[PDB]
């Protein structure tokens, strides 16, 4: 809706930074609204959904098993590892690592999962092979959050990310079981509370994944809809702002309020 793009424009003005935006119909794949759709933004932790998409593709192929247990050491633990820091002794299954990566944005979990698929280059090769030649992951946690201006490492575009997410959740790539697992993980997100969720009316479905990084970078990807069923994908990124986390959260929430209002 035009009023939503005005809110996105509002957000650019008030944050002093670029904002990228996509609304995508889930069923038809039609883009309903867009803003800076072909511009690059750091993915931050939103890449963790794509990472577990690649992991589930390997599970489908039998190259990976969700119950396989991985052990690791204190030296593997990087900043913000709220789940993985708790299982140095017992290790974690691949399923538990994806849950930690997506629902809690655990950084060590993401790096362990990246090792299982061959690293950032192999995530990027995975995306390339499902038809996304735009999105690229170049680095590990936590360096991938650096967001150096005009640096294209670890970036996506709003349009690339939205269509890639649509393919992962509803497209031919993954088995029915794996699509459902990926969206179940996203539905159980525990660290996107003040974002799109804060504008969501009772009884609506949302499955999402947020990100934050250096140099004011903030973002979220989501599948959401009324009556307990997703029907739209929404992507929002921003980078470059000196604004506080609180204000960046509130801008994303405002944009969400308008999307909901004019649904
Ligand atoms: Xe979905
Ligand atoms: Xe934003
Ligand atoms: Xe929302």
Curated annotation (Swiss-Prot):
Pfam families xref list: Beta-lactamase2
Active-site feature positions: 45 (acyl-ester intermediate), 143 (proton acceptor)
Sequence positions that bind substrate: 209-211
GO aspect biological process, one term: response to antibiotic
Biotechnological and industrial applications of this entry: This protein is used as a marker in many commonly used cloning vectors, such as pBR322 and the pUC series.
Class of the enzyme per the UniProt entry, highest EC level: hydrolase
GO-annotated molecular function: beta-lactamase activity
Cystine pairs: 52-98
Effect of residue 139 to S: In TEM-5, TEM-8 and TEM-24
Organism superkingdom: Bacteria
UniProt keyword annotations, A-Z: Antibiotic resistance, Disulfide bond, Hydrolase, Plasmid, Signal, Transposable element
Reported effect, residue 79 to K: In TEM-3, TEM-4, TEM-6, TEM-8, TEM-16 and TEM-24
Reactions accelerated catalytically: a beta-lactam + H2O = a substituted beta-amino acid
Effect of residue 214 to K: In TEM-5 and TEM-24
Keyword ATP-binding: no
Keyword Disulfide bond annotated: yes
Miscellaneous information on this protein: The beta-lactamase present on pBR322 was cloned from plasmid R1 (R7268). The class A beta-lactamase family has a specific amino-acid numbering system, sometimes called Ambler or ABL numbering and often misspelt as Amber. A multiple sequence alignment was used to derive a consensus sequence and then the consensus was numbered taking into account insertions and deletions. This allows use of identical numbers, e.g. for active site residues, despite differences in protein length. UniProt always uses natural numbering of residues, hence there appear to be differences in numbering between this entry and some papers.
Biological role: TEM-type are the most prevalent beta-lactamases in enterobacteria; they hydrolyze the beta-lactam bond in susceptible beta-lactam antibiotics, thus conferring resistance to penicillins and cephalosporins. TEM-3 and TEM-4 are capable of hydrolyzing cefotaxime and ceftazidime. TEM-5 is capable of hydrolyzing ceftazidime. TEM-6 is capable of hydrolyzing ceftazidime and aztreonam. TEM-8/CAZ-2, TEM-16/CAZ-7 and TEM-24/CAZ-6 are markedly active against ceftazidime. IRT-4 shows resistance to beta-lactamase inhibitors.
Similarity annotation: Belongs to the class-A beta-lactamase family.
The protein's name in its UniProt record: Beta-lactamase TEM
Organism from which the protein derives: Escherichia coli
């Amino acid at each position: 809706h035009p009023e939503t793009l005005v809110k996105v424009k509002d957000a650019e003005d008030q944050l002093g930074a670029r904002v990228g935006y996509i609304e995508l119909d889930l069923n038809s794949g039609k883009i309903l609204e867009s803003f800076r759709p072909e511009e690059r933004f750091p993915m931050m932790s939103t890449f963790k959904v794509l990472l577990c998409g690649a992991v589930l593709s390997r599970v489908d192929a039998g190259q990976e098993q969700l119950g396989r247990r991985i052990h690791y050491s204190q030296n593997d633990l990087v900043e913000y590892s709220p789940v993985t820091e708790k299982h140095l002794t017992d290790g974690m299954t691949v399923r538990e690592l994806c849950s930690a990566a997506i629902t809690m944005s655990d950084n060590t979990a993401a790096n362990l999962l990246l090792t299982t698929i061959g690293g950032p280059k192999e995530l990027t090769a995975f995306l390339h092979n499902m038809g996304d030649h735009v999105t690229r992951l170049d680095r590990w946690e936590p360096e991938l959050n650096e967001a150096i201006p005009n640096d294209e490492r670890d970036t996506t575009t709003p349009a690339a990310m939205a269509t890639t997410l649509r393919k992962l959740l509803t497209g031919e790539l993954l088995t029915l079981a794996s699509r459902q697992q990926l969206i179940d993980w996203m539905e159980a997100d525990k660290v996107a509370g003040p974002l799109l969720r804060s504008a969501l009316p009772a009884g609506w479905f949302i499955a999402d994944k947020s990100g934050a990084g250096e140099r004011g970078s903030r973002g979220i990807i989501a599948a959401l809809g009324p009556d307990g069923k997703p029907s739209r994908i929404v992507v929002i990124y921003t980078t470059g702002s000196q604004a506080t986390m609180d204000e960046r959260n509130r801008q994303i929430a405002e944009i969400g309020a308008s999307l909901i209002k004019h649904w």
